[PDB]
RNA sequence: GGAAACCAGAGUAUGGUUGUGAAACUUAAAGGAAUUGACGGAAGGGCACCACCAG
RNA sequence: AGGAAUUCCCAGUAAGUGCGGGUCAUAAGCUUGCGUUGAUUAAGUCCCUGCCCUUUACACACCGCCCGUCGC
């Protein structure tokens, strides 16, 4: 199994290297295909090798997988199987942190929370991979308030680092009751840039495919690179009029890191994107919106 | 430096300087009502 | 090293003049390709 | 039609439109002292309204 | 109705009568 | 004899230009659709350190 | 040696102890890693508090119709 995991990773990185070549290889194919379909001069860059493209074009069919994308390879079983999420905390947690980790279990369908004792960081990733855990969440705290969040996709998936800003928990609010706990509908709003499409994908795949008539709503709203997490359930009193009742925790997120590897590989994994605060134009730039 | 100037002198100086990064947004009722409006619109349209 | 840098400078002006000279010749060749469009289907 | 409308005489502006009865309204009349009127319709009912507060 | 679109799709359907092998050589000739 | 003759072209990209009242009034689907619609009760199958039991 | 109420917790888990780092976010009487010693009770029911579903692949065997209201 250890050799299998090492073998698969090299295939994953190796395919990532040639994704740019294959996109360039594909893009020049349609221009020739457009050139033959509508009788017009073949572009001079395609003037040579034109017959070779035609032969591969004639081979092209629906059966082939097509051009490879690293996002698809990372999230291979996103739709077919329901995700399995495990939630843990840092060593020696506070009382309020153990409340927060208890609430994230209810938010994510099918999540489980395990006590972090003396478990080294490396061993947890090994155990999660062995038992088929899809996603791993690690949460930090400062003076009884959660302050950091890490989301990791176990099969050599991307690792996303977050910092929390305005956390309000249900345990603060009296006599709320019990949650609906049904499979939720997802509302993603404000993500427009290419990186914004990347980040919204990571957050969406933490959830299973819901039912059509589900009344549970989870909203991720981006406003000036700050993502707002909101949890609501609605009741249709009558046509065109809807009532919203808030349930669940309320907190904000700020992304500053995405790494290709897992949280066991800080020393080897490459950085897809980092937040650089000491750039001269750092204060006047946003990345999740265009 | 610090020694030359009197104590708490800069509190009234009204100097001009720049900030490194954007301050965190402040939550208010107006933000809450606006955000609920976005969710309500998508619920009516069933634009999940 | 100083010699090699100077040699690159001559090439850049040389390539610049090469583009302009071929530009006049290219348009004549382009006109011939128009005729091949009309005869593409026929033979 | 089931609606009843209040208008100002000075300029002809409609202040309010009310659902009132479930069928055609048959008769209307104000109380003498104040801006309260009584209405009757084919819905077996009698209702009174405050023209100022539209209630 | 555009002849240029119409001519080509007529031409493609015409070639298929010849046979699959004759398709390759004629399509090669065109390009 | 054939010019050192003879006579007198496409692609992208970036910008421009254009192509008798529904409110002053109304959340009663501007007053709907339905053989296709709207609700309530009971029973069975599971589950929980958002519940029991033992600590 | 910290009432009334209330929160959390099932195995290298609860609890005690030391030793490092400050890593482009957060962090100073704080934050995160690493190791050492290492337990008591429990492996099951819907009784309370609730949650998610249902009551229209014909091997053998087993079993043999959920109910009510208003609209059209
Ligand atoms: Mg401990
Ligand atoms: Mg310990
Ligand atoms: Mg005590
Ligand atoms: Mg310690």
Can you spell out the DSSP letters for chain A?
A: -HHHHHHHHHHHHHHHHTHHHHHHHHHHHHHHHHHHHTT-PPPGGGTSSHHHHHHHHHH--TTS--S--HHHHHTTTTTTS---EEEEE-SS--HHHHHHHHHHHHHSTT-EE---SS--HHHHHHHHHHTT--EEEEEEEETTEEEEEEEEETTT--EEEEEE---B-TTTSSS------SPPEEEEES--SHHHHHHHHHHHTTS----TT--EEEEEEEETTEEEEEEEEEEEEETTEEEEEE-S-BEEEEEEEEESS-TT-TTT--EEEE--TTSTTSTT--SS--
Report the separation in Å between the CA atom of A144 and the middle of ligand 3, taken as the mean of its atom positions: 20
Q: How many CB atoms lie within 10 A of CB A73?
A: 16
Cα A215 to the center of its chain, rounded Å: 23
Alpha-helix residue ranges (DSSP H) falling in chain B = 29-45
A40 sits within 7 Å of strand F by its CB: yes
Which residue has tokens 């040639």? A18
Interchain contact A/E (3 or more Cβ pairs less than 8 Å): yes
Q: How many CB atoms lie within 10 A of CB C15?
A: 9
CA distance E8 to A36: 10
CA distance D39 to D30: 9
Method: cryo-EM
Backbone angles phi, psi at A240, to 5 degrees: 75, -10
Report the separation in Å between the CA atom of A13 and the middle of ligand 3, taken as the mean of its atom positions: 55
With contact defined as beta carbons under 8 Å apart, do D51 and D4 qualify? no
Query: What tokens appear for A72 in the block?
Result: 């698809």
With contact defined as beta carbons under 8 Å apart, do A231 and A246 qualify? yes
Report the chain E residue with the minimal C-alpha distance to residue C40: E30
Instruction: Give the single-character DSSP code of B11.
Output: G
Residues 13-52 of D with CB under 7 A from strand F: 13-17, 19
Query: Chain A residues within 8 A (CB-CB) of chain B?
Result: 165-166, 185-187, 189, 217, 219, 221, 223-224, 226, 228, 230, 232, 234, 240, 242, 244, 252, 277-278, 282-283
Is residue D18 helix, strand or coil?
strand
């Amino acid at each position: 199994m250890l050799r299998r995991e090492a073998r698969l990773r090299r295939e994953y990185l190796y395919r990532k290297a040639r994704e740019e070549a294959q996109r360039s290889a594909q893009e020049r194919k349609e221009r020739l295909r457009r050139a033959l379909e509508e009788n017009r001069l073949i572009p001079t860059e395609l003037r040579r090798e034109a017959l070779a493209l035609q032969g591969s074009l004639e081979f092209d069919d629906a059966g082939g997988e097509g051009v490879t994308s690293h996002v698809d390879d990372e999230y291979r079983w996103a739709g077919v199987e329901d995700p399995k999420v495990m939630i843990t905390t840092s060593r020696d947690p506070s009382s309020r942190l153990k409340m927060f980790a208890k609430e994230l279990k209810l938010v994510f369908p099918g999540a489980q929370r395990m006590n972090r004792g003396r478990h080294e960081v490396g061993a947890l990733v090994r155990a999660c991979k062995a038992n088929g855990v899809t996603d791993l969440l690690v949460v930090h705290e400062h003076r009884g308030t959660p302050v950091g969040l890490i989301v990791s996709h176990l099969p050599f998936g991307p690792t996303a680092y977050f910092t929390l800003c305005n956390v309000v928990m249900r345990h603060d609010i009296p006599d709320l009751g019990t949650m609906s706990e049904a499979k939720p509908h997802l509302i993603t709003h404000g993500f427009s840039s290419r990186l914004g499409k990347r980040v919204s994908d990571i957050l969406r795949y933490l959830f299973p495919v819901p039912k059509d008539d589900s009344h549970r709503v989870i909203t991720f709203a981006n406003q000036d690179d700050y993502i707002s997490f909101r949890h609501h359930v609605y009741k249709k009193t009558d046509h065109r009029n809807v009532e919203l009742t808030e349930v669940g925790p309320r907190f904000e997120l700020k992304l500053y890191m995405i790494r290709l590897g897992t949280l066991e590989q800080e020393a080897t994994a490459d950085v897809e994107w980092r937040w650089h605060p000491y750039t001269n134009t750092a204060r006047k730039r946003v990345f999740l919106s265009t | 430096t610090a020694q030359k100037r009197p104590e708490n002198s800069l509190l009234e100086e009204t100097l001009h300087f720049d900030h490194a990064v954007r301050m965190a947004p402040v939550i208010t009722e107006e933000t809450t009502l606006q955000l609920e409006d976005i969710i309500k619109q998508r619920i009516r349209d069933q634009a999940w | 090293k100083e010699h090699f840098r100077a040699k690159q400078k001559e090439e850049e002006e040389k390539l610049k003049r090469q583009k302009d000279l071929r530009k006049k010749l290219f348009r004549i060749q382009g006109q011939k390709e128009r005729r091949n469009q009309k005869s593409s289907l026929k033979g | 039609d089931r609606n009843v409308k209040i208008w100002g005489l000075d300029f002809g502006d409609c202040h309010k439109s009310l659902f009132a009865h479930d069928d055609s309204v048959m008769y209307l009349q104000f109380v003498p002292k104040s801006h309260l009127f009584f209405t009757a319709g084919k819905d077996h009912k009698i209702k009174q309204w405050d023209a100022d507060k539209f209630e | 109705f555009n002849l240029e679109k119409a001519r080509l799709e007529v031409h493609r359907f015409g070639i298929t009568g010849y046979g699959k092998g004759k398709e390759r050589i004629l399509e090669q000739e065109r390009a």
